[PDB]
């Protein structure tokens, strides 16, 4: 039936409806730190989120998305390995049922408790819908979360989760500043890959930050309280919404640092 993360509609099944699942530039991957090449020609990333306009938070049945007004160059990403300007459209998380799993990307096979994805689309394409059809249409910033100290900047999100418990619910979510989710350092790895949920289009330039952010155990616990199901359906907790690591194939992971 429709795709999800269960035993019967899980990631091992996606290929039947999205043959691209077995493509040559599928994401996520395992980042082998000793095999990543330092590339001195990579410029520093430029994150400009000071004018960010969040609008809404939605439970889509596979994660929760915070959405931004992308009608103008308000929250953009540029520099790094990118050409052109990429506008922030939404962010969402991938997490586990236990602290020992939940990230999509791994580092030397280490899994983190969660992974944040900030999705941006190439302004040369005019809209998101057109950008996913291009090899350089999207740029995704991935950030790992580990359990330790609470992240103050994440609490606003945590607190609205009760109001969007089941698939299809949404809530006004204005004045959220995504700068409160960045680590101190912007060092990163980059490789060409895809979206990690169907349609699995190979339109992404991934930018995965080296430094994780810490969240408290209690912050991560509130994530695990969401549902995959719609209201009035039997309860299926929203956990383990992560796709395992895919073959690297013909690709090189570049590092912005040594």
Q: Which residues fall in the annotated binding site for substrate?
A: 196-197
The helix/strand/coil state of 123 is helix
Binding site members: 92, 94, 117, 196-197
Q: Which is nearer to Cu ion, 87 or 117 (CB)?
A: 117
Q: Which is nearer to Cu ion, 44 or 230 (CB)?
A: 230
Smallest distance, Cu ion to C-beta of residue 229, A: 12
Smallest distance, Cu ion to C-beta of residue 41, A: 28
List the one residue from 111, 117, 210, 243 that touches Cu ion (CB under 5 A): 117
What does the alpha-carbon distance between residue 30 and residue 70 come to, in Å, rounded to a whole number? 31
What does the alpha-carbon distance between residue 141 and residue 79 come to, in Å, rounded to a whole number? 13
Smallest distance, Cu ion to C-beta of residue 85, A: 21
In the complex, which residue's CB is closest to Cu ion? Answer: 117
Q: Which of 207, 32, 40 is nearest to 118 (CA)?
A: 207
What does the alpha-carbon distance between residue 252 and residue 199 come to, in Å, rounded to a whole number? 23
Annotate each residue in 124-163 with x if it binds Cu ion (CB under 5 A) or - if it does not, as one string.
Answer: ----------------------------------------
Q: Which is nearer to Cu ion, 190 or 196 (CB)?
A: 196
Would you name the residues annotated as active-site residues? 62
CA angle, 142 as apex, 73 and 107 as ends, to 5°? Answer: 160
Considering only residues 42 to 101 of the shown chain, the ones binding Cu ion according to CB under 5 A are 61
Smallest distance, Cu ion to C-beta of residue 195, A: 7
Q: Which of 62, 126, 70 is nearest to 92 (CA)?
A: 62
Joined together, the tokens standing for residue 205 give 């330039």
With contact defined as beta carbons under 8 Å apart, do 28 and 140 qualify? Answer: no
Q: How many residues bind Cu ion (CB under 5 A)?
A: 3
Considering only residues 193 to 212 of the shown chain, the ones binding Cu ion according to CB under 5 A are 196
Question: Which are the contacts of 85, defined by CB distance < 8 A and separation ≥ 6?
Answer: 73, 76, 77, 78, 122, 123
Q: Which is nearer to Cu ion, 219 or 241 (CB)?
A: 241
Chain positions contacting Cu ion, by CB under 5 A: 61, 117, 196
């Amino acid at each position: 039936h429709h795709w999800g993360y269960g035993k019967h509609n899980g990631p091992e099944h996606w290929h039947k409806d999205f043959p691209i699942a077995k493509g040559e530039r599928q994401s996520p991957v395992d980042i082998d730190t000793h095999t990543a090449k330092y590339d001195p020609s990579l410029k520093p990333l430029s994150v400009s989120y000071d004018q960010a306009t969040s609008l809404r938070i939605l439970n889509n049945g596979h994660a929760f998305n915070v959405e931004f007004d992308d009608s103008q160059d308000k929250a953009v990403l540029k520099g790094g390995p990118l050409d052109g300007t990429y506008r922030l459209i939404q962010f969402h998380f991938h997490w586990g049922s236990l602290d020992g799993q939940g990230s999509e990307h791994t580092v030397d096979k280490k899994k983190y408790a969660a992974e944040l994805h900030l999705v941006h689309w190439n302004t040369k394409y005019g809209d998101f819908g057109k950008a996913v059809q291009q090899p350089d249409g999207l740029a995704v910033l991935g950030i790992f979360l580990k359990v330790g100290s609470a992240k103050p900047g994440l609490q606003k999100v945590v607190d609205v989760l009760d109001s969007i418990k089941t698939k299809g619910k949404s809530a006004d979510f204005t004045n959220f500043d995504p700068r409160g989710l960045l680590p101190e350092s912007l060092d990163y790895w980059t490789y060409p890959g895809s979206l990690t949920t169907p349609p699995l289009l190979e339109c992404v330039t991934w930018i995965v930050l080296k430094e994780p952010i810490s969240v408290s155990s209690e912050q991560v616990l509130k994530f695990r309280k969401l549902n995959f199901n719609g209201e009035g359906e039997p309860e299926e907790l929203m956990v383990d919404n992560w796709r395992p690591a895919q073959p690297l194939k013909n690709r090189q992971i570049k590092a912005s640092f040594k």
